[PDB]
C-alpha cells in the first residue's frame, strides 16, 4: 500500500540517507524509510504496527537527523522521513493563531521556518535553540535549550498542546487539560511514546532588535556569579538571553575568533589580558537585550557585574539575525569542510553547587593543553522554569548549568577518550549531573538518568503508549 504509493522506500539511497546523523560517529541502516505526504500515512504505519502480530519494525522519526549518537536510527526498522510531511504546498504546516498568541507547527518543521512564519505575523517563539535548523518535534523530544530558557523554560515549557500518534497508531491531541499523561511523557520523551505531528508553541510580540554583548572574565567565580546574577528571579532581570563560553589557553585566539563575535583586534586584546594575568582559561558571558533607552538599561545591568573593565563588547542586530546567528557559522565552516565531521559533543546539566568543581577539573584540568575546535558553552538554568512532570531529566538543584562541549573532530578517538575522562571525573567527584542529548546503552544508566520515580513513570507511559517498544529505538532505552 504505502510502498506501492511510493511512500515506503527500501532502495539503497533512501536507507543510506537515513543511516547517518550529525554526530557522524555511529550509523545504522534501516530496512525502510517512510516518506509520508500526510499524517494519515503515519497513522497508517503506526496502526499497522499496532494491529499486526509479529510486526517486525522499530520506527524512528527523523527530524533533520541532528542526533549525535544514532537516536534517529531504526536499525533494520523503519525510519520516518518527517520532512516529507512538509513537502505539499498546501495546506500550510505552520499556522500562527488568529490572535497571534501561539503558532501551530508540524513536528517536522524546522524552527527557522517557525520563526519566519511567526515574524510575518509580528510574533515569535520565546524559547529557542542556538541553532535553528532543528525540527519542532525533535527539540521537543529532548527539551530545546538556549539563552532564553532561564526565564522562559526550555522549549518543552512553551508548548500549549500537541497532536501525537502513539505506538497504538492512535492520533491523540494532548495538553495539560487533555491526555496530560501523554503530553507530559512526550515532552522530553525522546520519541518513545508517539510521533509529534503538531505542536502548539507559545509566542510573544516579536522584538525588532537585540543589543548583543559579550563580557570577558579570567575569574570563573566572577563569571559564574555574574551569570547567576543575570538569570536570577526578581519575574526576571532585563536580559533576554544569557549564555557563556569557555576558552582554554592553548587555543585561545583561535576559539575567540571562532565565536564570530570578536574582531581580530578584540581577540588580540583578550589574549593580551589573559597573558598579563597568566590565565589558563578565559570566560565570556553572552547576553542580549531585545527591544538611548537601551543604552541606559544596558548600562544599569552591566553596572551590577564584575567582568574585566574595558572588556564588554557590543553588537546591535536585528532579532532574526541574532536568532539565526549559527547558520552563518555552518555555511562558513562547511565551505572549509569543517561542518560535516564527527561531533563527539558532550552535553550535560551540572548542578550549581558543583559547577566550580567542574570548572577546576575540566576547563582548568582535562581540557588544558589541547587544541579545541568547537564552542565550550556554559550557562545557568532555573529549575523553576522546568516542569518535572515532563520526561526531561534535570539536576535537583534550583539552579543548574547547561554545559555543552561541542567538540569537532586520529582526533576522534582522542576526543572520545577525553569525554569518558570528563565523565569519570564527574562520577568520581560525585557530581550529580544529567546528560542532555546523549543516549545511554544500559538500563541502569537510563534509570539513573531519570531517577527512580521518573523512570517508573517513564515505563508506565511506555507500556501505555508504546507497549511493543517500537519507537525511537536509537535511544537505547527500551531497545
Ligand atoms: C545538529 C545540532 C543540534 C543541536 C544544536 C546544534 C546543532 C548543529 N543546538 C542545540 C541547542 O542549541 N539547544 C538544544 O536544545 N539542542 C540543540 N541541538 C540538538 C538537537 O536538539 C537534537 O539533535 C534533536 O534531536 C533535534 O534534532 P532533530 O530535529 O534533527 O531530531 P532528530 O535528531 O532527527 O531526532 C531526535 C529524536 O527525536 C525523535 N523525533 C524526531 N521528531 C519527532 C517527532 N516529530 N515526534 C516524536 N519524536 C521525534 C527521533 O526519533 C529521535 O529519537
Ligand atoms: C494549518 O491550518 C490549516 C487550516 O486552514 C490546516 O489545513 C487543513 O489540514 C487538515 C488536516 O491536516 C486537512 O484535512 C484540510 O484539508 C486542511 N485545510 C485546508 C484549508 O487546506 C493545516 O493542517 C494546519 N497546519 C497545522 C500544522 O496545524
Ligand atoms: C546545548 C547547547 C547548545 C547546543 C548546540 N548549540 C550550538 N551549536 C553549534 N554552534 C554553536 N555556537 C553557539 N551555540 C551553538 C546543544 C546543546
Ligand atoms: C561520517 O561522514 C563521512 C563523510 O565525511 C562519511 O564518509 C562517513 O561514512 C560518516 N560516518 C558515519 C558513522 O556517519
Ligand atoms: C491496536 O491493536 C488493537 C488489538 O491489538 C486493536 O483493538 C486496536 O483497535 C488497534 N488500534 C489501532 C489504531 O490500530
Ligand atoms: C597559553 O598557551 C600558549 C601556547 O598556545 C603558551 O605559550 C602559554 O604559556 C600558555 N599560557 C599559560 C598561562 O599557560
Swiss-Prot record:
E.C. code: 1.5.99.12
| Modified residue annotations for Pros-8alpha-FAD histidine | 66
Question: Where, by residue number, does FAD bind?
Answer: 61, 63-65, 67, 71, 130, 135, 141, 145, 196, 436, 472, 475
Q: Name one GO cellular component term.
A: extracellular region
Residues binding N(6)-dimethylallyladenine, per UniProt: 130, 329
Tissue expression as described in the entry: Expressed in immature kernels and unpollinated cobs. Weakly expressed in kernels harvested two weeks after anthesis.
**Which keywords belong to this entry?**
FAD, Flavoprotein, Glycoprotein, Oxidoreductase, Secreted, Signal
Instruction: Using the UniProt record, name the top-level EC class of this enzyme in a single word.
Output: oxidoreductase
- Where's the FAD-binding PCMH-type domain? 26-206
Entry keyword annotation includes Electron transport: no
Q: Where in the cell is it found?
A: Secreted, Extracellular space
The coenzyme or cofactor needed here is: FAD
Instruction: Consult the record and explain the modifications the protein receives after translation.
Output: Glycosylated; with approximately 10 hexose residues per site.
- Activity regulation text: Competitive inhibition by phenylureas.
Q: Which GO terms describe its biological process?
A: cytokinin metabolic process
Q: Which Pfam families match?
A: Cytokin-bind, FAD_binding_4
Residues annotated as glycosylated are 13, 24, 50, 95, 249, 278, 382
User: What is the reaction catalyzed?
Assistant: N(6)-dimethylallyladenine + A + H2O = 3-methyl-2-butenal + adenine + AH2
Q: What is its main location?
A: secreted
Residues involved in trans-zeatin binding? 130, 329, 404
- GO molecular function per UniProt: cytokinin dehydrogenase activity; FAD binding; oxidoreductase activity
Functional summary from the UniProt entry: Catalyzes the oxidation of cytokinins, a family of N(6)-substituted adenine derivatives that are plant hormones, where the substituent is an isopentenyl group. Cleaves trans-zeatin, N(6)-dimethylallyladenine (isopentenyladenine), isopentenyladenosine, zeatin riboside and cis-zeatin, but not dihydrozeatin, kinetin and benzylaminopurine.
Q: Which family does it belong to?
A: Belongs to the oxygen-dependent FAD-linked oxidoreductase family.
Self-association and partners: Monomer.
Name of the molecule in the record: Cytokinin dehydrogenase 1
The source organism is Zea mays (Maize)
Amino acid at each position: 500500500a504505502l510502498a506501492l504509493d511510493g511512500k515506503l522506500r527500501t532502495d539503497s539511497n533512501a536507507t543510506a540517507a537515513a543511516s547517518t546523523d550529525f554526530g557522524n560517529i555511529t550509523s545504522a541502516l534501516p530496512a525502510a524509510v517512510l516518506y509520508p505526504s500526510s499524517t494519515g500515512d503515519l497513522v497508517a504505519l503506526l496502526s499497522a504496527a499496532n494491529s499486526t502480530p509479529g510486526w517486525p519494525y522499530t520506527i524512528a522519526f527523523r527530524g533533520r537527523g541532528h542526533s549525535l549518537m544514532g537516536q534517529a536510527f531504526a536499525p533494520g526498522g523503519v525510519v520516518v522521513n518527517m520532512a516529507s510531511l512538509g513537502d505539499a504546498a498546501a495546506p500550510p504546516r505552520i499556522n500562527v493563531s488568529a490572535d497571534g498568541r501561539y503558532v501551530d507547527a508540524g513536528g517536522e518543521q524546522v524552527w527557522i521556518d517557525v520563526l519566519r512564519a511567526s515574524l510575518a505575523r509580528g510574533v515569535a517563539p520565546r524559547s529557542w535553540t542556538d541553532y535553528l535548523y532543528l525540527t519542532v518535534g525533535g527539540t521537543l523530544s529532548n527539551a530545546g535549550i538556549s539563552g532564553q530558557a532561564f526565564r522562559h523554560g526550555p522549549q518543552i515549557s512553551n508548548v500549549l498542546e500537541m497532536d501525537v500518534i502513539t505506538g497504538h497508531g492512535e492520533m491523540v491531541t494532548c495538553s495539560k487539560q487533555l491526555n496530560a499523561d501523554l503530553f507530559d511523557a512526550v515532552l522530553g520523551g525522546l520519541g518513545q511514546f508517539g510521533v509529534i505531528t503538531r505542536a502548539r508553541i507559545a509566542v510573544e510580540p516579536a522584538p525588532a532588535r537585540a543589543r548583543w554583548v559579550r563580557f570577558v572574565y579570567t575569574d570563573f567565580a566572577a563569571f559564574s556569579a555574574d551569570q547567576e546574577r543575570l538569570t536570577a528571579p526578581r519575574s526576571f532581570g532585563p536580559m533576554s538571553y544569557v549564555e557563556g563560553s569557555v576558552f582554554v589557553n592553548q587555543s585561545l585566539a583561535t576559539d575567540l575568533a571562532n565565536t564570530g563575535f570578536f574582531t581580530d583586534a578584540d581577540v588580540a586584546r583578550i589574549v593580551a589580558l589573559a597573558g598579563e594575568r597568566n590565565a589558563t582559561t578565559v570566560y565570556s558571558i553572552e547576553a542580549t537585550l531585545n527591544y538611548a533607552a537601551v543604552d541606559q538599561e544596558l548600562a544599569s545591568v552591566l553596572g551590577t557585574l564584575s567582568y574585566v573593565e574595558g572588556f564588554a563588547f557590543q553588537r546591535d542586530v536585528a532579532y532574526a539575525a541574532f536568532l539565526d546567528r549559527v547558520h552563518g557559522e555552518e555555511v562558513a565552516l562547511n565551505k572549509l569542510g569543517l561542518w560535516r565531521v564527527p561531533h563527539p559533543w558532550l552535553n550535560m546539566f551540572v548542578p550549581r553547587s558543583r559547577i566550580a568543581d567542574f570548572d577546576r577539573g575540566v576547563f582548568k584540568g582535562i581540557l588544558q593543553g589541547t587544541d579545541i575546535v568547537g564552542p565550550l558553552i556554559v550557562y545557568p538554568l532555573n529549575k523553576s522554569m522546568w516542569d518535572d512532570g515532563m520526561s526531561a531529566a534535570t539536576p535537583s538543584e534550583d539552579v543548574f548549568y547547561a554545559v555543552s562541549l561541542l567538540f569537532s573532530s586520529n582526533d576522534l578517538a582522542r576526543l572520545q577518550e577525553q569525554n569518558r575522562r570528563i565523565l569519570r571525573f564527574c562520577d568520581l567527584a560525585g557530581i550529580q549531573y544529567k546528560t542532555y542529548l546523549a543516549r545511554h546503552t544500559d538500563r541502569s544508566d537510563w534509570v539513573r538518568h531519570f531517577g527512580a520515580a521518573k523512570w517508573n513513570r517513564f515505563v508506565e507511559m511506555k507500556n501505555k503508549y508504546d507497549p511493543k517498544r517500537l519507537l525511537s529505538p536509537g535511544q537505547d532505552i527500551f531497545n
